[PDB]
Structure 1
């Protein structure tokens, strides 16, 4: 496998059943500023 595989990155979200990418912590679950996800 390859982490930088562009097709794999998009396949992971288009076809979640065949997703083959590193597992990550969603940004919204992290210790970030209050308005990080609210546009100005």
Structure 2
């Protein structure tokens, strides 16, 4: 089971070994326009 609270969110990136958050598809791997990832 995975946590969604604020501390867990930041801990997951700061200490990836102890990350306990839902796993998701990164936006860059999704079917989205190029302009979504390149700023104007």
Q: Same fold (TM over 0.5)?
A: yes
Please state how far the C-alpha of 1:34 moved relative to its aligned partner: 1.6
Q: Number of paired residues?
A: 40
Partner of 2:27: 27
Moved over 4 A (4+): none
Runs (5+) with no aligned partner, structure 1: none
**Aligned-CA RMSD value:** 1.4
Runs (5+) with no aligned partner, structure 2: none
- TM-score of the pair, normalised by structure 2: 0.87
- TM-score of the pair, normalised by structure 1: 0.87
RCO higher in 1 or 2 (8 Å CA, sep ≥ 6)?
A: 2
